[PDB]
Subunit: 463 residues, 4 copies
């Protein structure tokens, strides 16, 4: 019973109904103010912002800030993530990652090609296809230039057209016709780009902004090599995604897009050949930084879902997995089921942490995990206070730490200059599992230390 | 310019004015319901509760739950602590610990003896001095019996009457005339009790409930041997505390008390000889458990203030110290001033962490510190999210950890059964200090990454 | 100016001249006594033994015990290794590993095919090719059966005949016509066996015993995939090795062999089709166990030479590398040149240990290195006492340790049952490098603390 | 059945009988050559040297070098230590430390005062008591000046004359009448000196050279406060030591001395008032440095015996304790009895290492132990190769390490400049204990892997 939102207009109408989006009619400068407005919103847990009037381009193209920031909906901080993934506004952290991990066990659903889409109501070709017609947000003071892609999806196919990857990567503006961005060889955009370099031809590309809200989550997900995001999205929502043919390149793009930037990557510069957009386009942005923004609510969250699916595929009894937002997507929490010993009869607590480390180390996501804490599932790892309490009271100050050295996340902060320069540094797995213990010996709180009738009576008096 | 609240009535009238206390007129059972009501309040950040009607004793003696729990006052979660310590309702974590540490550098102020006090308006002697007249709260299902003292102060003097210690220790009820509690030889109540055992005489004692709100904070503070709490309280508030002579023992007690239990500790059982109380007495309780209760807001907080004073007395450039409530008073955070290298020219980051560890290890509080994180003072350690972000992004997953083994806190959770049985286990100091770095290279947030006029303009549009 | 010994007779005549081989004319039982005689010899640093008379087969086939054990030659414990590798009887540990590592930078020398060889003076075919004609030594009480190969070389080619690997692996006798041994898929015998399994044909093989003494050292060496041992041996000695065609299989075998066992590996059982041998054959054995035997003098030694070549190929300033015999080939010592900082200007001591760990982790030999100690080259790592002194006085008891977890050596002793069962466990790199220090501040000994004339004068008086 | 050697002449006559002392009749310079001659002797395991003719003083006073260096006696490297402690020339490492630890459980034996002694046959008083009459050896190039005491004993009493400590401490010559040396407040010479400073009087002292060989071993032993060395020596040998009254100070000195230097320590300079000596005096020296010298054979050895006695007094099942000479007295090895689990039923391997660490940390010797390895007693920790093999094959590369930080040995090499400057650094306890294992699963050697008759038969053939 999914509640898939089919485009950004539907997503915004649902946020509006829950008073979780605010319109700003005063002029906002894309030079630093739009980015600062997004940071204020994340950090104060404000409503998403629709910047209706931007210096330089006026009311032509709106900007959506904090598209999946923490929500203002009372009692539902994950509501933007939940709604983006077609779940109830009050879906829990565990229901979200479990829904994504469950879809990894299902067969991919091929998309369907539609003849027309609102994203092509307006078409700009040749010299008219110029990025100077749209906002060029300078998101942070020290950035190298305007970051045109922070929440949109890059689409590239292999030369034969048999495989297509969808990915969010940062793209910076050079001028009105050119953009640039990194093509890491360990990522899929780079692997596909190498195939176009071997044939000696420019790689065709498309960048879509403001699609249905589920796409940027799956485009952030580190799926295995050879698994298409569009197929996974189809299996996740239980129906085909509708794609439309691009106007100047042989690529299929989401029909739900607000804006489509088409072109070729020269053998790294993106060259714009066409820009298509629906009437009154909206360009979402994501302003990465300290917690909590979409680096944490989308990228780290879908990385936790992928870890949960990989650990379960290795038959480990993992109740849930989560990348705590306060740890800025540097940490993975792995919670084992209460009966993990019955499910894995031959291993001690140290043994199951060794096995988790071994399984995670064989996957694509291992370098992202600066720390993995292994805990019992009486802890909700999305509850900041309960998670800090469990780590402080269950992880020894000296033992239960399994260090590995190898490839590291170059964006992670906890590395020395030498470790960064070598791309070689430590990653740890910390054992916070308890021995078999009665609920009242490991807890001391309202819900764990008082009989049901006493709690009921207190709830009647106070709630 | 202190704003000292002189008794519990004044404290409660100030909480009432800020809508931070709620009266419960329905009957509440001291058998588990009062304790459960206190846990619900802590965990939901509710107003302090005045339980006006208790099963067994009716409206005779009221119970105050969550006397210094987190406050409901908007934007002021530490308001109960701040008001208890005579500070503004909005005093920050740093102003609180800094005010306490500043008083450790001042000369003690001797108390003054008053002839009469409201705590002696009603006097019960002999067979009338029976604890069965007052509530006997069973605070948690598995407790050994009713805990009569969780927030009151125990007063004991040395045989010569030259030195008096005030301390909060748990006291359990045996029957109407007797109570029991531990007398650890490493603590001051035990050290003073040994002097009464050498002379072969029962130690006189007094337990006061519901005093002025500052007393339980200083009675929780692990001050050095030979420093009286009453003298420190006097130096802290900048005026003498008023004491009154006890009716059946040669002891001075706070004139601000709600209830005074007098007696002798038999050579360990407390035997009640007299009970005195003011009209409509209030018996506060503290229901220790998971975060956040007075174990964290008072005991861990005053332990952080004592650590800050000890580190500063060793000439270390410590900006602030704090025991994060989410880590259940297991962790100390030590923040160094930005110019610590100018102040300590001969030490590297590792060197200053070694020095901090050496200084803390020579003090009475070292065994309580399961982990100490050493960080820069651009982090507010009382901000849960910023603290977790700083630890995750600045503490290496492998290096910068200084482990010591020795005496441990027997109540701390992060120890194995063998470490607890030996009383011997690990304590760690973790280095999260950064090399010299520009603000924009170590931060990415609203307040650190945008110019003042851009932030002002965003605040005008959104706040 | 190599001094290559061309067969086992020449090797034995050189040991005889230095009184480093002893003949035992009394009968010795291959059931445990030959193995026990080899252990006594290793452990007491006795001469190599020529067992002239064996129970069951009499004087037909002699056994050579401790072929490369520590030598009795005064002042030359490595003499058997040195002579085996064509070096002077007094070649140092460093000259040995440096000679092997220098040959890794030279082009391979193709062997030459000779028409006849002494190893085919006697030929046994069909039912006559029966292992019951030769000794079947039970080397240790608890072994599964007789180990026929402990010091001989297994020869296998790829189906096309374009690539040949030579390797020492343990082979156990089943009966007179069959033997068995492990074919690990991570080793070359297994990788080549997989190619014969794909075609669905039995893999032809040959096992040679008692070849020229240099062959078992290179057959123990973990060379990169695609580097033939015969080509390396040729480059090392500076001349082609002479091979002869096997009688019943399309394989080339060393013409210097004492015995040649030919056959096919059935898709794991070795089936004997022919046995050829020179008059008065000698079957060498190696009896692995505690230090010091050929596990240490040959396998660990050639593994240190391969590590030295790999570290130098990555441009690291490595003076020498060594696997100390007392650590039973569990440890690698890496010594840096005195001017390593001038050669690697951008790295601290920690940084160069990180780089060494990164380089070693990318190679085939990483899992063998349970511990790597990185030291200065003022330490001779082949001097037991100086090495223990340098580790104790230069490796911090807490810091400078870089742990990695991954594949482990299943034969290494320092792993728990769970780490062995998972094949996953810790390997460490320990930093024992000093800061720049004057010779007299880091040494206190005869050769480092007294002027040249004072030492000369003492040598004149005492030596 | 002790074989106590009563003076240095008897000790030297016993070494002579075993060809373990060599006389050098050629002139040797005390300026560097005597020290270099001692280093050559230690490092080449040469006989002890009697330097009969010294530049400057001729044949007046002989020098004994390497008094307890490793012995030349075949199969008995510890013979000088064994003979010094009244044991058989072939006493094992374990018999030596066990004999010393057994004496710690016996009542002290008061000495006896004799009227005359050979050490007073020649008496120098006033201006004749001048150190320029005796050799002034400059033992190492960079020393601050001549070290007059390296193997002799300093004798000091408390002002009341109720307690006397005997200790070896380095004493440097200033001129003919004055010497200097450190008086560490944590050591006994300093503690006794503080009592003479409180009364405002110079502390009388005596330095004895060339006593009976057992005295420098006990004068090196870190016995508890209040245990006199003379009483311990008496209990160890099972008879009273004979003392003689000093000529110019109220002190008793060993009657077995070669030379007695008497005087007062000025409130730190030793001032010489009298020198007494027996005919043809011998002045022994000890030239500390790299292994192996008396720092290792005496100081570290008696420290291992004291650790063995302290661990046994805490009821730990310790088979033996040893400070390996190759680790330069930086390491303690603690071996547990095979049945330690039966003797300590409630502890795991980690638990017993925690308990050992806790017991050692409460003693005077804890700061000396940079590393403690806890092993099973199937390992002889005095066998260099077996010890290195056991550490490499039984101590995990990552786990089983218990680090403590605290006071360190300022002479130990394994500390950074910051740790030395603070006097604060890490000390580790490493767990090398095995789970219950059959002899053949943990050993592979001649004595452990072959039946008794097979070994007997091999010994008959080869030994
Ligand atoms: Na992708
Ligand atoms: Na106190
Ligand atoms: Na090979
Ligand atoms: Na002493």
């Amino acid at each position: 019973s999914m509640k898939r939102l089919k485009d950004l207009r539907e997503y915004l109408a649902v946020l509006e109904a829950h008073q979780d989006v605010r319109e700003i009619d005063e002029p906002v400068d894309p030079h630093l103010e739009a980015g600062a407005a997004a940071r204020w919103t994340y950090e104060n847990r404000g409503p998403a912002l629709m910047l209706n009037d931007l210096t330089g381009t006026g009311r032509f193209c709106r900007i959506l800030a904090a598209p999946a920031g923490l929500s203002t909906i009372p009692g539902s901080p994950l509501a933007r993530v939940a709604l983006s993934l077609g779940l109830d506004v009050s879906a829990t952290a565990h229901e979200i990652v479990d829904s994504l991990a469950a879809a990894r066990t299902r067969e991919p659903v091929a998309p369907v090609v539609v003849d027309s889409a609102p994203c092509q109501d307006n078409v700009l070709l040749g010299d008219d296809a110029n990025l100077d017609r749209f906002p060029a947000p300078l998101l942070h003071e020290g950035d190298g230039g305007p970051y045109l892609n922070t929440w949109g999806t890059i689409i590239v196919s292999t030369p034969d057209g048999s495989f297509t990857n969808w990915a969010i990567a940062r793209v910076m503006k050079i001028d009105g016709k050119r953009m640039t961005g990194t093509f890491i060889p360990t990522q899929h955009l780079g692997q596909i780009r190498k195939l176009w370099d071997n044939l000696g031809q420019p790689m065709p590309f498309a960048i879509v902004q403001g699609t249905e809200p589920g796409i940027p989550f799956v485009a952030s997900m580190p799926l295995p090599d050879g698994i298409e995001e569009v197929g996974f999205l189809g299996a996740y929502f239980g129906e085909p995604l509708e794609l439309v043919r691009a106007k100047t390149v042989d690529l299929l793009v989401p029909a739900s897009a607000e804006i489509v930037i088409e072109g070729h990557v020269m053998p790294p510069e993106y060259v714009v050949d066409a820009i298509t957009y629906r009437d009154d386009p909206i360009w979402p942005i994501s302003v990465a930084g300290e917690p909590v923004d979409e680096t944490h609510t989308a990228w780290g969250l879908v990385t936790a879902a992928e870890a949960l699916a990989l650990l379960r595929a290795a038959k480990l009894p993992v109740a849930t997995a989560w990348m705590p937002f306060e740890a800025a997507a540097h940490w993975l929490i792995v919670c084992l089921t209460e009966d993990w010993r019955e499910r894995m009869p031959g291993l001690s607590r140290d043994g199951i942490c060794l096995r988790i480390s071994q399984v995670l180390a064989a996957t694509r996501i291992e370098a992202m995990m600066t720390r993995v804490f292994v805990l019992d599932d009486d802890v909700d790892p999305s509850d900041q206070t309960e998670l800090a309490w469990a780590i402080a009271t269950r992880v020894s100050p000296a033992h239960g730490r399994l260090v590995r050295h190898g490839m590291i996340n170059p964006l992670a902060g906890c590395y020395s200059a030498e470790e960064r320069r070598l791309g070689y540094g430590p990653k740890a797995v910390l054992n916070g599992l308890l021995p078999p213990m009665a609920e009242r010996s490991r807890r001391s709180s309202f819900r764990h230390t008082y009989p049901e009738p006493v709690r009921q009576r207190v709830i009647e008096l106070l709630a």
